[PDB]
Scaffold this active site. Structure first.
Site, PDB file in Angstrom:
ATOM      1  N   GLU A  35       0.828  -1.211   0.000  1.00 27.84           N
ATOM      2  CA  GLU A  35       0.000   0.000   0.000  1.00 27.84           C
ATOM      3  C   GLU A  35       0.867   1.268   0.000  1.00 27.84           C
ATOM      4  O   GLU A  35       0.649   2.176  -0.802  1.00 27.84           O
ATOM      5  CB  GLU A  35      -0.976   0.052   1.208  1.00 27.84           C
ATOM      6  CG  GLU A  35      -2.145  -0.979   1.240  1.00 27.84           C
ATOM      7  CD  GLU A  35      -3.205  -0.870   0.128  1.00 27.84           C
ATOM      8  OE1 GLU A  35      -3.494   0.232  -0.396  1.00 27.84           O
ATOM      9  OE2 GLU A  35      -3.792  -1.923  -0.185  1.00 27.84           O
ATOM     10  N   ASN A  46      -8.128  10.143  -5.592  1.00 26.66           N
ATOM     11  CA  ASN A  46      -9.026   9.547  -6.577  1.00 26.66           C
ATOM     12  C   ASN A  46      -9.882  10.672  -7.120  1.00 26.66           C
ATOM     13  O   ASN A  46     -10.781  11.163  -6.451  1.00 26.66           O
ATOM     14  CB  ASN A  46      -9.906   8.482  -5.928  1.00 26.66           C
ATOM     15  CG  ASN A  46     -10.913   7.878  -6.888  1.00 26.66           C
ATOM     16  OD1 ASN A  46     -11.211   8.439  -7.938  1.00 26.66           O
ATOM     17  ND2 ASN A  46     -11.462   6.733  -6.513  1.00 26.66           N
ATOM     18  N   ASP A  49     -14.248   9.899  -7.082  1.00 23.85           N
ATOM     19  CA  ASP A  49     -15.109  10.084  -5.923  1.00 23.85           C
ATOM     20  C   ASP A  49     -14.528  11.132  -4.986  1.00 23.85           C
ATOM     21  O   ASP A  49     -14.817  11.148  -3.795  1.00 23.85           O
ATOM     22  CB  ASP A  49     -15.345   8.743  -5.202  1.00 23.85           C
ATOM     23  CG  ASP A  49     -14.137   8.261  -4.406  1.00 23.85           C
ATOM     24  OD1 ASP A  49     -13.024   8.770  -4.639  1.00 23.85           O
ATOM     25  OD2 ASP A  49     -14.321   7.373  -3.539  1.00 23.85           O
ATOM     26  N   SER A  51     -11.987  11.454  -3.269  1.00 22.50           N
ATOM     27  CA  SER A  51     -11.444  11.036  -1.971  1.00 22.50           C
ATOM     28  C   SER A  51      -9.902  10.857  -2.012  1.00 22.50           C
ATOM     29  O   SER A  51      -9.300  10.788  -3.094  1.00 22.50           O
ATOM     30  CB  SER A  51     -12.155   9.771  -1.443  1.00 22.50           C
ATOM     31  OG  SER A  51     -11.780   8.581  -2.126  1.00 22.50           O
ATOM     32  N   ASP A  53      -6.468   8.727  -0.111  1.00 22.91           N
ATOM     33  CA  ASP A  53      -5.904   7.705   0.778  1.00 22.91           C
ATOM     34  C   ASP A  53      -4.652   8.293   1.462  1.00 22.91           C
ATOM     35  O   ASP A  53      -3.820   8.919   0.840  1.00 22.91           O
ATOM     36  CB  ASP A  53      -5.616   6.395   0.034  1.00 22.91           C
ATOM     37  CG  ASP A  53      -6.848   5.485  -0.051  1.00 22.91           C
ATOM     38  OD1 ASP A  53      -7.912   5.875   0.465  1.00 22.91           O
ATOM     39  OD2 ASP A  53      -6.770   4.373  -0.607  1.00 22.91           O
ATOM     40  N   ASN A  60      -8.840   5.614   3.672  1.00 23.69           N
ATOM     41  CA  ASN A  60      -9.700   6.526   2.941  1.00 23.69           C
ATOM     42  C   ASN A  60     -10.389   7.663   3.704  1.00 23.69           C
ATOM     43  O   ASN A  60     -11.000   7.435   4.752  1.00 23.69           O
ATOM     44  CB  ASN A  60     -10.739   5.698   2.177  1.00 23.69           C
ATOM     45  CG  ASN A  60     -11.458   6.507   1.126  1.00 23.69           C
ATOM     46  OD1 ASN A  60     -12.467   7.133   1.400  1.00 23.69           O
ATOM     47  ND2 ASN A  60     -10.910   6.536  -0.079  1.00 23.69           N
TER      48      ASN A  60
HETATM   49  C1  LIG Z   1     -11.220   1.475   0.660  1.00 28.88           C
HETATM   50  O1  LIG Z   1     -12.398   1.955   0.064  1.00 28.88           O
HETATM   51  C2  LIG Z   1     -13.501   1.092   0.265  1.00 28.88           C
HETATM   52  C3  LIG Z   1     -14.613   1.711  -0.528  1.00 28.88           C
HETATM   53  O2  LIG Z   1     -14.207   2.981  -1.023  1.00 28.88           O
HETATM   54  C4  LIG Z   1     -13.795   0.928   1.749  1.00 28.88           C
HETATM   55  O3  LIG Z   1     -14.803  -0.077   1.913  1.00 28.88           O
HETATM   56  C5  LIG Z   1     -16.013   0.301   2.449  1.00 28.88           C
HETATM   57  O4  LIG Z   1     -15.788   0.681   3.803  1.00 28.88           O
HETATM   58  C6  LIG Z   1     -17.003   1.028   4.474  1.00 28.88           C
HETATM   59  C7  LIG Z   1     -16.619   1.686   5.783  1.00 28.88           C
HETATM   60  O5  LIG Z   1     -17.752   2.244   6.431  1.00 28.88           O
HETATM   61  C8  LIG Z   1     -17.858  -0.221   4.602  1.00 28.88           C
HETATM   62  O6  LIG Z   1     -17.140  -1.236   5.301  1.00 28.88           O
HETATM   63  C9  LIG Z   1     -18.211  -0.718   3.197  1.00 28.88           C
HETATM   64  O7  LIG Z   1     -18.835  -1.983   3.300  1.00 28.88           O
HETATM   65  C10 LIG Z   1     -16.957  -0.888   2.349  1.00 28.88           C
HETATM   66  O8  LIG Z   1     -17.319  -1.046   0.984  1.00 28.88           O
HETATM   67  C11 LIG Z   1     -12.548   0.464   2.473  1.00 28.88           C
HETATM   68  O9  LIG Z   1     -12.808   0.423   3.867  1.00 28.88           O
HETATM   69  C12 LIG Z   1     -11.398   1.418   2.165  1.00 28.88           C
HETATM   70  N1  LIG Z   1     -10.162   0.968   2.769  1.00 28.88           N
HETATM   71  C13 LIG Z   1      -9.416   1.818   3.463  1.00 28.88           C
HETATM   72  C14 LIG Z   1      -8.122   1.246   4.021  1.00 28.88           C
HETATM   73  O10 LIG Z   1      -9.770   2.978   3.694  1.00 28.88           O
END
Ligand SMILES: *[C@@H]1O[C@H](CO)[C@@H](O[C@@H]2O[C@H](CO)[C@H](O)[C@H](O)[C@H]2O)[C@H](O)[C@H]1NC(C)=O
Ligand SMILES: *[C@@H]1O[C@H](CO)[C@@H](O[C@@H]2O[C@H](CO)[C@H](O)[C@H](O)[C@H]2O)[C@H](O)[C@H]1NC(C)=O
Length: 130
Positions: A35, A46, A49, A51, A53, A60
């Protein structure tokens, strides 16, 4: 900064990452390497959207931390994404720990699935004395 494999292995060890909810130290070492390449200042935007990282675990801004410019941010980690770019990873860890308590767990990092899942990660912590 950029940690060195074994400094990070011990450092996360001290922060309680080994076995944290069934996630071995090696798994964390693997997703940190892919990562961010052990860099706490890493940042990826990104355009779609709107956003971003942040830091070593590339967490995120739409779901976990707040940067005040990502549309629909919930800030589950109740942190400033800023906290994710300082050299001390204490809060980066407190947050990655929150991340895995979600339904998908470590499946939250695509790099994990791509390069860590089913690729035996015993290699990343061997020699660090952890
Ligand atoms: C990476 O992005 C994913 C989507 O943009 C994110 O996944 C989502 O996280 C939500 C948190 O409330 C929930 O669990 C959703 O079900 C899921 O799709 C993921 O957590 C992100 N990863 C990081 C490390 O930020
Ligand atoms: C970063 O990794 C995340 C999980 O490894 C990923 O988000 C997940 O995507 C799933 C798609 O089937 C599903 O919506 C999960 O609920 C969600 O958390 C995210 O998309 C990855 N980042 C990118 C840019 O793809």
């Amino acid at each position: 900064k950029v940690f060195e494999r074994c400094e990070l292995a011990r450092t996360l060890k001290r922060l309680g990452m080994d076995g944290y909810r069934g996630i071995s130290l090696a798994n964390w070492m693997c997703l940190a390497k892919w990562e961010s390449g052990y860099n706490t200042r890493a940042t990826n935007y990104n355009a779609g959207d709107r956003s971003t990282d942040y830091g070593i675990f590339q967490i995120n801004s739409r779901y976990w931390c707040n940067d005040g410019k990502t549309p629909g941010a919930v800030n589950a980690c109740h942190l400033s994404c800023s906290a994710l770019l300082q050299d001390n990873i204490a809060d980066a860890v407190a947050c990655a720990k929150r991340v895995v308590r979600d339904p998908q767990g470590i499946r939250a990092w695509v790099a994990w699935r791509n390069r860590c899942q089913n690729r035996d990660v015993r290699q990343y912590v061997q020699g660090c004395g952890v």
